[PDB]
Amino acid sequence: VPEICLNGLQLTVTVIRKQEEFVKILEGDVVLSVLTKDPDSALFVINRVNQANLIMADFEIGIRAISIDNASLAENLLIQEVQFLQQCTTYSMGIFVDWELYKQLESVIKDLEYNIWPIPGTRAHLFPKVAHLLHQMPWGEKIASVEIATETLEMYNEFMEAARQEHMCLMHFKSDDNVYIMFGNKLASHFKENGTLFSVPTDRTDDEFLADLPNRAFVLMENEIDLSTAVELDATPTALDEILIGKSVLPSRVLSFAGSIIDLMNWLRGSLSKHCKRDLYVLESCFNFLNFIEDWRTSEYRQAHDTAEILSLLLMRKLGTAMNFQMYQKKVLTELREIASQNFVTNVTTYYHYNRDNHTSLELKTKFGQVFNCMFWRIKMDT
């Protein structure tokens, strides 16, 4: 047995980081690895697979989910897991890589020659829900000038594709009113211009981010769902793991990842049907399965799933009320009071009005989509 199985995976960050700080190992007979930025949402899916028995088998799928905080260390950590899963593991499946890290590391994956699959992008779940929370936001009768600050240009191309589907074309004028729709955690940090600011965070927020925003800025974020007990997840009696109690998951990082696992575990039920005998598939009676592992990327096995079909199959149907994409306004009296809420399952956007200055009637304002309906791009690189 070699050295990498005894010691695990190591990083030189000039601190020698041991294995148990970054990977969250959940024990299972046929392992899997996920190279992700959000590891708490990865083990919630693989907890919900084994309690549901998607593969209707005796064994349980493990996950060795690697945390990514630095994008430059994703190339080093992809080498060490391919050097782990070939050697130390008897029944491996493959490495799932996030779509931000899949497009970065395209030269590395094709030269490594292992089963490395992409997790789909979470911006297909967020940027339609950004632009639908924009489209029915109440507003005055003044058309404003929209300047959009982004972390990359792929976030600009996926936003205005989603703005075009909601029939909004956002134009910039030489107008006194301004609108700044910012995409990223580090971008809206003590900004000084006088327009209304729509901060869209692209990762998990911390206590630096809610303090460094300007006053009366809008925050377009999703709710982290706090996991405490297993009876809050489903009325069907399951068990939540002890590594997951007290942790929080993201609904974009769950539902993008659980769209690919149900495409993979329904492949695995057919691959244990022809190769293994039962009505539970016992691994002592299973021989030579996982032969052609790249065949689930072929479209006869990869299907698109509805969000209410994912939550019903994976025995987590009580999380549909807690899966929201909300808009928060930071008003220092510092308290981020709530403006909007768009649910993930049934997309019913709900706007919250607080009756300030004691009125018995409220005139309904015109929406932002009816004002900002219907070309060259001026791009400034700044730091």
Please answer whether residues 34 and 245 qualify as being in contact, where contact means their C-beta atoms are separated by less than 8 angstroms. Answer: no
Query: For residues 63-92, b (16+ Cβ closer than 10 Å) or e, as one string?
Result: bbbbbbeeeebbeebbebbbebbeeebebb
Q: Which of 253, 230, 231, 228 is nearest to 240 (CA)?
A: 230
Q: CA-CA distances (angstroms) from residue 107 to 71, 110, 113, 121, 220?
A: 15, 6, 11, 19, 34
Q: Minimal distance in Å, beta carbon 227 to a second copy? A: 34
Q: Residue 119 touches which of a second copy, ligand NAG, none (CB < 5 to 8 A by kind)?
A: none
Q: Minimal distance in Å, beta carbon 311 to ligand NAG? A: 11
Q: Does 150 bind a second copy (CB under 8 A)?
A: yes
Q: Does 206 bind ligand NAG (CB under 6 A)?
A: no
Near a second copy in 182-201, by CB under 8 A: 184, 186-187
Near a second copy in 108-147, by CB under 8 A: 145-147
Q: How far apart are CA 148 and CA 378, in angstroms?
A: 11
User: Which 8-state DSSP code applies to residue 298?
Assistant: S
Could you tell me the two tokens for 319? 């999380």
Q: Residue 363 touches which of a second copy, ligand NAG, none (CB < 5 to 8 A by kind)?
A: none
Residue, CB closest to ligand NAG = 72
Q: Which residues is the chain interrupted after (C–N above 2.5 Å)?
A: 13, 278, 333, 374
- CB-nearer residue toward a second copy: 60 or 147: 147
Task: Specify the 3-state DSSP secondary structure of 330.
Answer: strand
Q: Does 361 bind ligand NAG (CB under 6 A)?
A: no
Q: Does 156 bind a second copy (CB under 8 A)?
A: yes
- CB-nearer residue toward ligand NAG: 207 or 357: 357
Binding residues (CB under 8 A) for a second copy: these are 145-153, 156-157, 160, 169-173, 184, 186-187, 375-383
Binding residues (CB under 6 A) for ligand NAG: these are 70, 72-73, 128, 346-347, 357-358
